[PDB]
Amino acid sequence: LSLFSVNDFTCSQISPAAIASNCYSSLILDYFSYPLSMKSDLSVSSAGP
Amino acid sequence: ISQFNYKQSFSNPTCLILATVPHNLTTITKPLKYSYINKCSRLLSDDRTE
Numbered sequence: 001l002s003l004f005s006v007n008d009f010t011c012s013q014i015s016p017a018a019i020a021s022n023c024y025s026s027l028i029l030d031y032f033s034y035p036l037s038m039k040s041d042l043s044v045s046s047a048g049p
Numbered sequence: 050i051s052q053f054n055y056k057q058s059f060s061n062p063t064c065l066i067l068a069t070v071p072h073n074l075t076t077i078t079k080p081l082k083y084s085y086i087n088k089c090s091r092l093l094s095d096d097r098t099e
Binding site: 021022023 | 095096097098
């Protein structure tokens with residue numbers, strides 16, 4: 001997160017400290033080219049394209 | 050039952066009874082269902098380190 005610049009950080013059923021501190025069985029990291037212009041459609045409880 | 054629900058003491062002569070009242074003693078009233086606790090744990094701020 002320090003390497004990049006934070007623009008949006010939204011989570012469901014979990015807190016930022018929970019994901020950043022809790023130990024997990026195996027973390028899955030997905031990255032993609034997502035512009036900030038369509039932030040209304042990148043959400044867990046969203047119906048965007 | 051033992052680890053969350055009901056425990057006896059090893060340090061004493063504890064004896065155990067299981068009984069049933071078929072019909073006669075109407076003085077006792079029956080419950081709706083049997084409820085027994087299976088999980089009881091304290092969740093710290095450590096976020097699922099339980």
